[PDB]
Design a protein around this ligand. Structure first.
Ligand SMILES: Nc1ncnc2c1ncn2[C@@H]1O[C@H](COP(=O)(O)OP(=O)(O)OP(=O)(O)O)[C@@H](O)[C@H]1O
Ligand SMILES: Nc1ncnc2c1ncn2[C@@H]1O[C@H](COP(=O)(O)OP(=O)(O)OP(=O)(O)O)[C@@H](O)[C@H]1O
Ligand SMILES: Nc1ncnc2c1ncn2[C@@H]1O[C@H](COP(=O)(O)OP(=O)(O)OP(=O)(O)O)[C@@H](O)[C@H]1O
Ligand SMILES: [Mg+2]
Ligand SMILES: [Mg+2]
Ligand SMILES: [Mg+2]
Ligand SMILES: [Zn+2]
Lengths: 636, 650, 651
């Protein structure tokens, strides 16, 4: 229907003279600078934003979106043909692939004889000589689709879908162009690869071996061949776009090149790509016809809401003396009360600083167990923290138990062998694992959680598995202490009903009891009725921060390693020995150990991180001790 | 070969008859309006009631049902002609328009067991349960290839030879130009139709109780693919056909048969309603007339066979109406479902109420104490064993999303199961994970549960805490908790017994005259239509299901229609209602709320405040109020006050 | 595999170029007119001059001459579009509209000898002679079948895969229904196009002398089939192509090649002349303005290079014009052809008059005394030798039907040959029969013969009977007999020698520049077009070296040809004054006492002499374009017969 020479001229014009004011209102020829970087081998992937193309050619964007492989090829050809005139100097031959490329170019010019007409099969394939990758950032005018609804009418189209990454393979070499050499001739044979499998060539087709009518057997070689980084990921529908009685639908995304190593399992991503078929050869198929598998060919992978990858006033509120309180009060502002609980949860999000002295690691993660009466927002707070934290996993009861927490060995699909997949504690490694209904958790899981919370590893020596998993996750647990309710007739450690080891692993065991109280029940009921009435928490002095903003603040506080002075050591020691003396003297106290002191230290370093200082001060210690004291306040 | 046909007589006559049937203007206008409605809904399949054809054309109806393939080709050509007559551009958009069939297939209505070889090339209506679904795959029907050397563009057509002979020339994919220039396929310009295969099994409740199940394979093609998921109960109408084997010089005479669906419909003919203008007007007048005691009238009309339990019936009406989910902007969630627990003495009709809700509500799932254990109640994770990939499997509570799970003998469940129910009951979702897959399944179901107290009979001299055996966290999930006692008072006994004997005397009107209730022995069901997949006076005529003519009761069909309309209402808490509810909650949390020798049946937590809000919202929905007024709040508060306390005797 | 071409850029450009060339309305609409004209007279082949296409679009012209089927199918699509635009009903009435080619082919003009393999799939122009035509066979292009069992009617199309690969599924004739129900074909509903194969040989007078001849097989499809018969010198334009062999498994690499005709044309001398309205106006002006002496103006302008023989030239004009054939109701026939015999001394330019009529007259056939022998002169009957059947073969005088046989050295012709031509010279037909076949072929020809008298030279002192060695039966059917005599009078020698020497000094303007020699040698002929099939005309010749100067002009050869063609169609009717004069004239001619002593009869006077008086008067009236045979016409006839039929014997 359309002339592709005209379309290649169109895309060449767009690339050469599209400009914006991205750097401070300065017209900079957005794609010309990238073409320069591509010509100097300083940049591999070029992402073409179809919003830019629509700004000056909307029907080009529609053509791109309705036959996307064709236009990925056209754009790659335009870039190939534009690169020679954007080269300002000589490439330094970054790697071995470059050495091969420029030897091939050198030998082609050397024996050129330009006026001669060569065979169409006697040049280098285009993809053998690129060293750049071209991708589309789909137009914002295209609404994201639901994985279920990406069907046969969208084969060959540029679509965006959103989902959770459930399974992503390791980066592997996928061959793009197979290179062979001959035992007779000294030419190279090239086999561009489109299929999922190929039959390696046997004879060479070289001119010099066709003249000689020799054997000319050719030898497949990795050296001159071309590979690409390749990952296979599965991606699932979000819970909120699954129909009523259904389970979420997966799509296979074939990730390759510079788009690899972006998405890890558990990530919320938005993927732009082309929806393409893979022919289903071989299977003696019940139905006649050319049936094929589908996949998404990735072009742009963007990590979404919690997986997401400052103005002077922003730093102003960071430097505000009430920043800690404002962040803590932004924790699930629809739950009334629980002010100190939200402070403790904020500290869990920030965490302490890991210490590695002389080969003896002590974690920086903070663990918190909310053990409360029924209906006190424990599951709501757990769910909020799961929504907010960047690498969080939520588990409940025994729906994700055993290998849903640890790893399991699973049949690989890409090659077919036994690959290790992590459960919740691996997907939450270096994040938060929210373990709801902790008191009703299978004992094998509880022992695994012992090792996770202190050693930050999972050791497995079962039949198919002999490994040690990294599980460097904070544990936010929720439980009911004994028989559903806290009764004062029985001591702690009797209605807590956690062994001293497990109990001591938690930096804070927060006790919540909802004792009835007329004015307090009115305050809660008014808050809740307002929330039911307006779908939001009532106005207060300070508007709560967005979850994006909260994430940014917490992240900035994360890389803020503060140290403990020598001057505080006596103060901290006195606090520890004091806590320990109440534990001994009191008859209704929990188990106190050196873990209580480490809890003091890491709580206070998390406070200091929140002030974004580099040295823990006495007020940080003071607030940490107050938190440890409040954690058992309800029993008074 | 290469022959064409010059005005085939039978195809011409058939297409004429079908276009006469479709062009309904001198007649009632049914199918002409239906074709307009598919044009406007942007669809390309018309579902035709075969009874309408029998009414208009016995000869067509019989020939269509017995020679399905060519008849359906004629009737789809006629449909395309008719659609073009109404709207030529729409007809231009879609290559072919399709025809699904529905209605009453007399002897063609079969089961997977009864679908024998005598129905080959006939239209059949098969009912069963979907055991396996394939992935939805695209099947290329028109491939477009560009030749970069010559700049030429090529198109190849692939005809649907699923059940026809397919010579290898019919399936070659072009890869080279005539002079061996490579072609590149234009994926975006090619046309694909997606293709699925499912297996339908004879429903376990309908299979002969002894032997192994019988199945049939079904090919689903575009528009029909994702209509059924494993575990669904479906009707599939389609053509039963032999598939071709591969090319070979030897054959056993053995052929592999499939059903090519022309229509798929869910058993849930209770999950899709049909409202005419008169129905809507009747609903509107019923809501406007008595907008005050309409709720009581609906409640007392709920399980008419059960006498008494007025509060329990009001609560069940609130459960069937529901509250409103709060979906906060930060993704936070407050549920809008009501969960009810019925504790009580033996034989007080709580199983009857569960059975009523099972036969009344849409998307209602039944489950008993130990008949659904572990993963049969919430979801499960299994491994595909063909691809080696993990798969999700939906349990009772996932399948009841936006529905009801009626858990009978709740006390005889395991504690493992009862603690698995917790997350579904409060947060409305199932979170399950094995190593290769983690999901969060929506189970937005309300739970109606019936249990017996410990000791089987409720001891009135012990507190309700120790008669119910449930811990406080579980009890908190159930927002209403009814103790249904067998008070052996003679007056109440007379009331109950008179009612029961009247229901044991009732005989259906004219349909019966002294005869017995048939067993329905698996050949009688296929004789008639299935009421499950089948195709309003606001009141019932009074005979002796009621003693005297003093207070009318709502028709069951109208009550289904009315509740379906009222469920969509989203009443808003007004400030007076919110203040009243807050004050009542603070009073109810306090000790003065309970006198001496009265005891709490369930704890009062913040969940009780949301219980009040949800009950008031459901009450407001019953009136179609759009606001939660003070009357709704005080009805909710009296429900809670009634259910949450119990006087203990000495 | 079955695909369709969604986009062929080349086909689009080609069709657009051809429709653009055909639209023509801005450029004096020549092909616009040609297409409306083929619509008018119910044809479906458009003959396209490639010189016009080369003018309008040279790139198309080269592509078409070099890739013949691709370009011809594009051009026929364009032609069907053009016809549909002009008239959609006629365009739908024919499935295919063909394009034939015409004009100048540079190196694509060949003979069967120079047509080599470097011309496969190119359009070529081949000239030659037809050696064998086949029968005209119908080839089924669309077969319709009826199944009585199911009342269904099916149809199956057969593409023309004559020079393309044919897979066996392409040629299966349906006999059965899918249920194996017998089909029966609807012959009147099926479509057949007729097919014929001819063989074109290199012309004997063009081939290298002494070598064996080279031929080419030629395929003719519908409306081109009966266009040639064996012995015709034709020009065939078509595509040169290699025929598919039969599905083998081993091939020797050899292909039969064939020419697929897109146009066939005859010698343009025998074709209907083109008549611009100015030409008809000029003819009417000529005839009306000069009416009394128009006959003499045409006659003395006949063979300008021959001096004298004015009566002979008048008679030869009458032969070129002819009488009018009578076709009586009872089937009886009277000839309108004039037969002329010239007997004379050696070198009196009678072979030159024969040659002039050969050059000028349409359908003139040469022959010498012993170059034709009976069967070669009239028809022949041979046996087909491959079907076993008798076959008729046309000889010289059948090929000269509605034409002239110019028999030279008629006296040296054997006696049996002259006996053979008796029946043609009067009845205009050849009766021929072997036992399996009998025929009565039409040979409506006029005979112009040259003979020499007995003793080689005419003897003035002997009777013309004793000096012409022919009998009264042969003489009497020569309706004019001229004794062309070499009298050695000195003033006559003045005149003749002056004229002859004047013809031996003339150079053709421009072409000759002072010393040129004319010949070309066996390549120069194919270098340019043939002036035998090639496609402003004055009335009088301008003065030149042919004549000195005087007050009497010279009719142009081209104008005379057009004028004679127009006048030959006229059928002047004998009037009653003419009839009375001719009757009394003939009665006087028969009676010898009217004619002097010492004057002998060259030929006898019979009723044939009366018929020839009528024929000559009619031809004269044709020259004047009279539509009536007036008394001047009868007088001219009688004076010509009087001059011819008597000779003065000397002593
Ligand atoms: N400040 C608050 N305190 C208690 N409950 C609240 C508060 N704000 C809101 N709620 C309500 O509590 C209800 C949820 O119960 P929740 O999620 O607290 O159970 P839980 O704390 O896990 O108790 P359990 O121990 O029974 O599992 C939510 O609907 C929420 O709206
Ligand atoms: N108002 C009523 N009160 C009690 N029973 C009734 C009433 N109306 C009808 N029944 C009858 O009582 C019988 C027994 O009821 P059902 O089996 O539902 O009791 P149940 O409460 O489920 O007992 P269990 O707790 O042992 O399961 C039923 O046949 C029902 O029809
Ligand atoms: N009257 C004449 N005018 C012009 N040329 C003449 C005349 N008479 C003779 N010639 C010339 O004489 C030459 C020979 O003439 P031609 O061959 O026609 O003689 P002919 O009468 O056929 O002889 P024959 O009877 O021996 O065959 C011709 O080239 C012709 O030009
Ligand atoms: Mg909870
Ligand atoms: Mg029961
Ligand atoms: Mg001569
Ligand atoms: Zn080699």
């Amino acid at each position: 229907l359309k002339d592709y020479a005209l379309e290649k001229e169109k895309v060449k014009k767009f690339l050469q003279e599209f400009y914006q004011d991205d750097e401070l209102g300065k017209k900079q020829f957005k794609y010309g600078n990238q073409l320069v970087r591509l010509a100097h081998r300083e940049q591999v992937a070029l992402y073409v934003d179809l919003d830019d193309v629509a700004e000056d050619d909307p029907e080009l964007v529609d053509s791109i979106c309705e036959n996307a492989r064709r236009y990925a090829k056209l754009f790659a050809d335009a870039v190939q043909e534009l690169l020679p005139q954007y080269k300002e100097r000589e490439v330094v031959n970054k790697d071995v692939l470059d050495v091969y490329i420029e030897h091939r170019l050198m030998m082609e010019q050397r024996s050129r004889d330009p006026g001669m007409v060569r065979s169409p099969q006697n040049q280098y394939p285009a993809e053998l000589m690129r060293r750049f990758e071209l991708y589309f950032q789909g137009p914002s005018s295209n609404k994201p689709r639901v994985i279920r609804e990406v069907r046969a009418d969208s084969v060959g189209k540029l679509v965006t879908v959103r989902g959770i990454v459930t399974r992503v393979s390791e980066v592997k070499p996928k061959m793009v162009v197979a290179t062979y050499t001959c035992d007779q001739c000294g030419a190279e044979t090239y086999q561009p690869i489109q299929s999922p499998t190929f039959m390696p060539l046997i004879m060479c087709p070289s001119q010099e071996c066709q003249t000689n009518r020799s054997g000319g057997r050719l030898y497949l070689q990795t050296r001159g061949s071309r590979f690409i980084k390749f990952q296979e990921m599965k991606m699932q529908e979000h819970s909120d776009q699954v129909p009523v009685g259904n389970i979420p639908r997966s799509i296979t995304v074939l990730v390759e090149g510079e788009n690899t190593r972006i998405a890890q399992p558990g990530d919320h991503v938005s993927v732009t790509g082309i929806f393409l078929p893979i022919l289903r050869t071989g299977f003696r198929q019940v139905v006649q016809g050319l049936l094929s598998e589908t996949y998404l060919e990735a072009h742009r992978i963007v990590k979404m809401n919690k997986s997401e990858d400052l103005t002077r006033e922003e730093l102003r509120q960071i430097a505000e003396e009430d920043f800690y309180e404002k962040l803590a009060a932004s924790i699930a502002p629809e739950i009334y009360g629980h002010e100190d609980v939200k402070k403790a949860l904020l500290l869990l999000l920030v965490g302490g600083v890991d210490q590695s002295p002389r080969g003896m690691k002590i974690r920086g993660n903070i663990n918190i167990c909310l053990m409360g009466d029924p209906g006190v927002a424990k599951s709501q707070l757990l769910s909020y923290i799961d929504r907010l934290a960047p690498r969080s996993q939520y588990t409940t009861g025994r729906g994700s138990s055993g290998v849903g927490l640890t790893a399991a060995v699973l049949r690989d699909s890409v090659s077919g062998e036994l690959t290790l997949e992590g459960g919740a504690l691996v997907l939450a490694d270096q994040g938060v694992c929210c373990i709801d209904e902790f008191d009703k958790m299978a004992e094998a899981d509880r022992t695994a959680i012992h090792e996770v919370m202190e050693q930050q590893t999972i050791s497995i020596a079962k039949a198919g598995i002999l490994t040690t998993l990294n599980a460097r996750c904070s544990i936010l647990a929720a439980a009911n202490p004994a028989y559903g309710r806290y009764n004062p007739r029985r001591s702690l450690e009797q209605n807590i009903q956690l062994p001293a080891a497990l109990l001591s692993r938690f930096d804070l065991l927060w006790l919540i009891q909802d004792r009835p109280d007329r004015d307090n029940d009115l305050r809660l009921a008014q808050h809740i009725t307002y929330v039911h009435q307006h779908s939001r928490q009532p106005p207060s002095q300070f508007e709560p921060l967005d979850m994006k903003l909260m994430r940014r603040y917490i992240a900035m506080c994360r890389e803020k390693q503060p140290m403990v002075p020598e001057s505080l050591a006596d103060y901290i020691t006195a606090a520890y020995v004091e806590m320990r003396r109440e534990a001994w003297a009191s008859k209704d106290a929990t188990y106190t150990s050196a873990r209580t002191l480490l809890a003091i230290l890491r709580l206070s370093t998390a406070l200091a991180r929140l002030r974004m200082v580099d040295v823990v001060e006495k007020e940080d210690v003071n607030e940490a001790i107050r938190l440890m004291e409040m954690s058992k306040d309800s029993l008074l | 070969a290469g022959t064409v046909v010059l005005d085939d007589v039978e195809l011409r006559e058939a297409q004429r008859d079908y276009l006469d049937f479709l062009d309904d203007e001198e007649d009632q206008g049914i199918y002409q309006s239906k074709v307009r409605e598919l044009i406007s809904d942007n669809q390309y399949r018309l579902i035709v009631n075969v009874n309408d054809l029998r009414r208009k054309n016995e000869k067509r109806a019989n020939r269509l049902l017995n020679n399905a393939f060519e008849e359906l080709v004629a009737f789809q050509r006629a449909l395309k002609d008719f659609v073009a007559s109404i709207d030529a551009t729409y007809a231009k958009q879609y290559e072919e328009f399709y025809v699904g069939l529905e209605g009453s297939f007399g002897s063609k209505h079969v089961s997977p067991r009864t679908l024998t070889s005598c129905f080959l090339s006939c239209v059949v209506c098969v009912e069963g349960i979907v055991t396996k679904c394939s992935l939805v795959r695209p099947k290329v029907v028109r491939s477009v290839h560009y030749c970069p050397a010559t700049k030429k563009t090529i198109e190849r057509r692939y005809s649907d030879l699923t059940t026809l002979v397919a010579f290898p020339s019919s399936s070659v994919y072009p890869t080279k130009d005539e002079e061996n220039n490579p072609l590149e396929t234009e994926y975006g310009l090619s046309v694909y139709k997606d293709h699925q295969t499912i297996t339908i099994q004879e429903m376990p409740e309908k299979a002969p109780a002894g032997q192994l199940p019988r199945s049939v394979d079904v090919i689903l093609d575009d528009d029909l693919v994702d209509k059924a998921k494993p575990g669904d109960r479906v009707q599939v109408v389609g053509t039963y056909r032999c598939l071709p084997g591969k090319k070979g010089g030897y054959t056993s005479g053995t052929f592999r048969t499939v059903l090519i669906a022309c229509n798929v419909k869910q058993m849930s003919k209770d999950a899709q309603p049909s409202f005419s203008a008169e129905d809507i007007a009747k609903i509107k007048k019923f809501s406007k007339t008595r907008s005050k005691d309409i709720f009581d009238q609906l409640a007392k009309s709920l399980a008419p066979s059960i006498h008494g339990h007025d509060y329990v019936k009001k609560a069940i009406l609130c459960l069937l109406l529901g509250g409103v989910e709060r979906d906060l902007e930060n993704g936070s969630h407050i549920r809008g479902d009501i969960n009810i627990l019925l504790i009580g003495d033996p034989s007080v009709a709580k199983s009857q109420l569960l059975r009523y809700v099972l036969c009344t509500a849409p998307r209602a799932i039944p489950t008993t104490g130990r008949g659904s254990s572990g993963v049969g109640l919430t979801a499960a994770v299994t491994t595909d064993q063909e691809t080696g990939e993990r798969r999700l499997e939906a349990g009772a509570m996932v399948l009841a999303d936006r529905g009801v799970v009626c858990i009978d003998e709740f006390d005889k469940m395991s504690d493992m199961d009862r603690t698995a129910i917790h997350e579904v009951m409060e947060q409305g979702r199932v979170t399950i994970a094995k190593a290769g897959i983690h999901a969060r399944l929506n189970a937005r179901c309300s739970v109606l549960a019936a249990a017996n107290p410990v000791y089987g009979r409720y001891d009135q001299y012990k507190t309700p805490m120790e008669n119910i055996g449930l811990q406080d966290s579980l009890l908190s999930r159930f927002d209403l908790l009814f103790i249904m006692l067998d008070q052996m008072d003679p007056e109440q006994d007379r009331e109950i017994s008179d009612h029961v004997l009247r229901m044991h005397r009732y005989r259906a009107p004219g349909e019966q005259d002294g005869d017995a209730m048939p067993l329905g022995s698996a050949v009688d069901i296929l004789a008639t239509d299935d009421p499950n997949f089948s195709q309003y006076e606001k009141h019932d005529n009074l005979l002796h299901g009621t003693k005297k003519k003093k207070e009318k009761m709502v028709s069951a069909a109208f009550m289904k229609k009315y509740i379906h309309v009222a469920k969509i209402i989203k009443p808003v808490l007004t400030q007076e209602s919110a203040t009243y509810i807050a004050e009542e909650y603070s009073r109810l949390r306090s000790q003065d709320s309970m006198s001496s020798d009265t005891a709490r049946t369930s704890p009062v937590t913040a969940r009780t405040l949301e219980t009040l809000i949800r009950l008031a919202t459901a009450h407001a929905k019953a009136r179609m109020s759009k606001t939660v007024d003070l009357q709704d709040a005080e009805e909710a508060v009296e429900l809670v006050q009634y259910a949450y306390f119990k006087k203990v005797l000495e």
